[PDB]
Amino acid sequence: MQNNEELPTYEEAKVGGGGGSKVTQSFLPPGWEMRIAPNGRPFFIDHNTKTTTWEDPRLKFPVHMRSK
């Protein structure tokens, strides 16, 4: 496939110097960030929980800002 869906480290996500194959603007919820992965796809970034994912929780809930 033209994507690997390899979720890179968060340290990579701060820059996200990936590649572009399936890249576009996905349905990121507020509070999150969306960066480009080297495998050619954008992933979601959550700064509150310091996590990343390919699946947007936006579909079920919008910005759920983890306070602490």
Swiss-Prot record:
Compartment list: Cytoplasm; Golgi apparatus; Endosome, Multivesicular body
Induction note: By androgens in prostate, and by albumin in kidney.
Superkingdom per UniProt: Eukaryota
Modifications made to the protein after synthesis: Phosphorylated by SGK1 or PKA; which impairs interaction with SCNN. Interaction with YWHAH inhibits dephosphorylation.
Tissues where this protein is expressed: Ubiquitously expressed, with highest levels in prostate, pancreas, and kidney. Expressed in melanocytes.
Domain WW: 26-59
Function summary: E3 ubiquitin-protein ligase that mediates the polyubiquitination of lysine and cysteine residues on target proteins and is thereby implicated in the regulation of various signaling pathways including autophagy, innate immunity or DNA repair. Inhibits TGF-beta signaling by triggering SMAD2 and TGFBR1 ubiquitination and proteasome-dependent degradation. Downregulates autophagy and cell growth by ubiquitinating and reducing cellular ULK1 or ASCT2 levels.
Comment, domains: WW domains are involved in recognizing PPxY motifs in substrate proteins.
SUBUNIT field: Interacts with UBE2E3. Interacts with NDFIP1; this interaction activates the E3 ubiquitin-protein ligase. Interacts with NDFIP2; this interaction activates the E3 ubiquitin-protein ligase. Interacts (via WW domains) with SCN1A. Interacts (via WW domains) with SCN2A. Interacts (via WW domains) with SCN3A. Interacts (via WW domains) with SCN5A. Interacts (via WW domains) with SCN8A. Interacts (via WW domains) with SCN9A. Interacts (via WW domains) with SCN10A. Interacts (via WW domains) with CLCN5. Interacts with SMAD2. Interacts with SMAD3. Interacts with SMAD6. Interacts with SMAD7. (Microbial infection) Interacts with Epstein-Barr virus LMP2A.
Disease: Periventricular nodular heterotopia 7: A form of periventricular nodular heterotopia, a disorder resulting from a defect in the pattern of neuronal migration in which ectopic collections of neurons lie along the lateral ventricles of the brain or just beneath, contiguously or in isolated patches. PVNH7 is an autosomal dominant disease characterized by delayed psychomotor development, intellectual disability, and seizures in some patients. Additional features include cleft palate and toe syndactyly.
Protein name: E3 ubiquitin-protein ligase NEDD4-like
Organism: Homo sapiens (Human)
Lineage: Eukaryota, Metazoa, Chordata, Craniata, Vertebrata
Gene (name only): NEDD4L
